[PDB]
Amino acid sequence: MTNSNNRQSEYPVDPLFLDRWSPRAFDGSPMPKEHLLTILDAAHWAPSASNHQPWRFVYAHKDSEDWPLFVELLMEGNQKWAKNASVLLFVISRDHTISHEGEKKPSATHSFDAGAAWFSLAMQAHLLGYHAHGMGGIFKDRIVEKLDIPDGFKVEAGVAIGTLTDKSILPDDLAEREVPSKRVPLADVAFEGRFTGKAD
Amino acid sequence: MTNSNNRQSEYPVDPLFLDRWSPRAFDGSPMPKEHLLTILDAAHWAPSASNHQPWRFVYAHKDSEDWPLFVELLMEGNQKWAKNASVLLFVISRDHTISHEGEKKPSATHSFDAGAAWFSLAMQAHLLGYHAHGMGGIFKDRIVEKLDIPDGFKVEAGVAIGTLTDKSILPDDLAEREVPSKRVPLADVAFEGRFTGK
């Protein structure tokens, strides 16, 4: 198996899958504009049903006139550490398809497909030497109103991206959590032939 | 800017993001059991809200007693080509959690998180020299029934995984589509400061 990033996999996974993680101690430095565009470019190369590409990204750099708005759209707990990230953005998805004639049909996969784009985002960030950190502790209705998100678009998650620094900058409770998370055994989620896992 | 796999990126992305794609011409060869486990192990390392890990994967190898069933759970247009993949599986997500005291709570991010696991699956497949192909043209209610999926678990997608072969094996309409797909300009989906698209 693989040993990497204080994690051990049961099978020889690429170390990239263990090395990608979501810390909270960010150094508050500026990220080059092209680096963020590369990250979002990788994200937008994700697969999606019918190649509909339902994801959207609304982003702000730490030097933005709207940085404080992006910070205050997160819940207080997340603000405490995410305010020191280099970039904040929201991952959004179109919850329908719309035709040339403006006819709307509910999308069965838009959130799923947005998640693929988000992993791609996190992976590209990782590859450039950054860490991305997903957030659901966010004010979704305020995001929609303040960021002019049109009807039929869903806020999936916030994302903080930055350069990792020493945990000492964190309050003690977060510093204690600054360690890569573990996973359940593969056999608890991967079943041959039929669903053999417990329902709970 | 990056050029790879008959695709061109606007920004210098890792060529892995361009090289990963979803062909339909598969060679029907057996995939080693450990290779599929490595793929799903990568998938299960995805991030998820609260580290709930809501994904499940139900899989069969082409050599399987279950293969005919797995093939028949795909719509006909998918069967035509996916029946020649090495592995077929369904990505499933748990739509809820339950407290110590028994209170069921809907999960807001379970499909989104499953999607992250699916990209991870597809990327690890790619890195081992295979190709994964996602499928929504599937019989979900029949999948739930036949594969004994419990209540509160959602079928997200089918996935075919295998080893690419010459497109000549495909019917013409699919042969024409056996090329790496394109994307909208980045600026059409990435907006600074405010949502400005459409």
Ligand SMILES: Cc1cc2nc3c(=O)[nH]c(=O)nc-3n(C[C@H](O)[C@H](O)[C@H](O)COP(=O)(O)O)c2cc1C
């Ligand atoms: C959609 C989603 C929402 C998340 N929301 C939060 C959050 O609001 N606050 C937080 O500290 N972490 C949040 N996370 C981080 C997860 O807890 C983390 O990704 C998970 O524990 C796995 O750890 P890893 O990403 O380091 O592998 C979220 C992750 C996902 C993908």
Ligand SMILES: Cc1cc2nc3c(=O)[nH]c(=O)nc-3n(C[C@H](O)[C@H](O)[C@H](O)COP(=O)(O)O)c2cc1C
């Ligand atoms: C959830 C989803 C559902 C899909 N359903 C089908 C389908 O049923 N039939 C098919 O041939 N391809 C299907 N695909 C393939 C997509 O059309 C394909 O991933 C997209 O055009 C982008 O191409 P790429 O993955 O080669 O980069 C599906 C993909 C996604 C992720």
